[PDB]
Each structure stands twice: as C-alpha cells, then as structure tokens.
Design an enzyme around this catalytic site. Structure first.
Site, short mmCIF file in Angstrom:
data_model
loop_
_atom_site.label_atom_id
_atom_site.label_comp_id
_atom_site.label_asym_id
_atom_site.label_seq_id
_atom_site.Cartn_x
_atom_site.Cartn_y
_atom_site.Cartn_z
N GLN B 78 0.63 -1.45 0.19
CA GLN B 78 0.08 -0.37 -0.12
C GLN B 78 0.92 0.77 -0.26
O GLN B 78 1.27 1.90 1.51
CB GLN B 78 -1.25 0.22 1.42
CG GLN B 78 -1.71 1.16 1.80
CD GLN B 78 -3.09 1.26 0.37
OE1 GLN B 78 -4.62 1.15 0.74
NE2 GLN B 78 -2.64 1.65 -0.75
N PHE B 79 1.08 1.68 -1.28
CA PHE B 79 1.70 2.72 -1.45
C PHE B 79 1.47 3.99 -0.80
O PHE B 79 1.96 4.94 -0.13
CB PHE B 79 2.67 3.65 -3.35
CG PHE B 79 3.30 2.39 -3.37
CD1 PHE B 79 4.84 3.20 -3.87
CD2 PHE B 79 3.18 1.61 -3.91
CE1 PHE B 79 5.63 2.50 -4.02
CE2 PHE B 79 4.17 0.62 -4.48
CZ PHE B 79 5.42 1.24 -4.62
N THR B 80 0.02 4.18 -0.29
CA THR B 80 -0.52 5.44 -0.05
C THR B 80 -0.16 5.16 1.51
O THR B 80 -0.04 6.73 2.05
CB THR B 80 -2.24 5.52 0.16
OG1 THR B 80 -2.40 3.97 0.81
CG2 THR B 80 -1.79 5.33 -1.41
#
Lengths: 144, 144
Positions: B78-80
């Site tokens: 999850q890059f966010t």
C-alpha cells in the site's frame, strides 16, 4: 483528531450478528479522538475527509472527492488510532480522548459530515465486526 | 517503513475477480515502504507486527500476539501509507520508496514474517479488491 480512511466499494458494521450500518461506494472512516480535540478540529477534519482527492475520475486519475464520486461515509469510532505504538509491543493511550469527549466529537463529526453527504455509522463503544472491500486498496491517514 | 494492521476474522485479496490470497483469523497488514527503508528496518517491523499485543486472551484482555493467537498475516503493498497528507486535499509522496525498492522490501518483509507464521499476500502493483472483516475493530499504525 484522526480519520483513517479506506476507499471502499461497500462496507458494513455488524453488532452481535446484526448489521447496524452499511454503505455502497464511499469511504470507511475509522475515527480517533485525541485529547485536545474540539469541535473546530472536527469541522476541519470533516472537510478534509469530504474533499480529499481519493476517487478515480473518468480517466483513472485520483482526482475526485467522495462528494463528486457520489459516495457515502461509514463512520466508526476507533480508539486505537490515537495510540502511541513507538516503543515495546503494547500500545499506550496517553493522547487518547476520554470516552465522554470521544463520543461527543464522534457524534459531532458525524453531524458535520452529514451536512454534505449521506453517512452511516457504527455504534460507539460496542464490539463491532466491520466488513469492507478496500478498492485499490487506497488508504490515507488524515489528521488535524 | 509502515505496517498499518487490522485485526481480522478473515480477509482476502481479489485481482480481476479472482481471489489470489486469503486468510482466516489474523492481521491484514497494509505495508508502506519509504525512502531510506532497508532490510534492517524490515526485520524490525516484521518483529513488531509478529509480536504486537493485539489479540484477546482467554479473558478478553489485549494480551496475545498473532503467533500466540494462531493467526496468519495477509500482506498487501500500500503505497498510500507513505503519503504526506498534511496540506491541501491531495496526497504527496516525497517519502515514498521507488517501486523497485518498495517491491524488494515488500517481498523481503513477507519472507521475514514467513519465518514465524503462515502468511499470504496480494500482488505488488496490481489493482486489488481487498475484503476483510476488522474484528473490534482494532487498527494500529506501526512503523520503523
């Protein structure tokens, strides 16, 4: 105050085997109330959640907010967001708001969001089984 | 490095309508790789996730870690989580690791956790529909 948001295609909150709140497309908003929070911080966080660019437009760019995307918010009280998790292996809650203040600002944040969008909720201080489909997934930790 | 963990009774990751990973009781671990992360930070975060006191013992006290609770981890990139969300209404990713480094440390973190517990995963850089039931709910933002 913290709003940990997850972009969902659907979500619901069950309490003792019964669904008490559900939404279709929108955001599951886990809400953490801290000491020092007040209605003003709530107003600011509600605005942030309601206008955050988290949804795909007609071209797949993360350009729309939940209002433009025609979604809903499922707001669930989550005391663990305010935890300090830096040391050791057990969370600490020195920044956590008292249950009284947290319930107050939780219900207030709900009211503020409802001014602009359909919202559903869990129940404060109830054991909840929160089911959702995080679409992306997309998850943002917002705070004020 | 960030591991945003949710205590679940079950969770799964679907990619293009097909389930590619699923777990029963355990933790959904959304994993965010930052610039400056390395194998050492991964080792430390895996240990933290694996030993964090997040599960109920025979008396309902949040006393057990996922190993003691006989659970699994569902690890999803999850890059966010590494986003900066302080200003404005659009996330910024200055602290985000490059896709190459993030995929490397993501697969590495998976290996490190597998040394101690059954783990399942999503797919790096694939659009995923992550379904879960957050039991509590219980959510902790862990980081190193």
């Amino acid at each position: 105050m913290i709003a940990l948001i997850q972009r969902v295609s659907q979500a619901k909150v069950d309490v003792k085997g019964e669904t008490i709140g559900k939404i279709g497309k929108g955001l599951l908003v886990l809400l953490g109330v801290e000491k020092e929070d007040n209605r003003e911080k709530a107003d600011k966080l509600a605005e942030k959640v309601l206008n955050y660019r988290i949804f795909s437009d007609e071209n797949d760019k993360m350009n729309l907010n939940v209002q433009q995307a025609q979604g809903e918010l499922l707001i669930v009280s989550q005391f663990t967001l305010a935890a300090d998790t830096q040391k050791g292996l057990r969370p600490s809650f020195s920044k956590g708001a008292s249950p009284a203040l947290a319930n107050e600002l939780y219900e207030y944040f709900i009211q503020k969001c409802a001014e602009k969008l359909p919202v559903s909720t869990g129940q404060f201080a109830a054991d909840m089984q929160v089911s959702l489909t995080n679409d992306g997934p997309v998850t943002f930790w917002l705070n004020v």
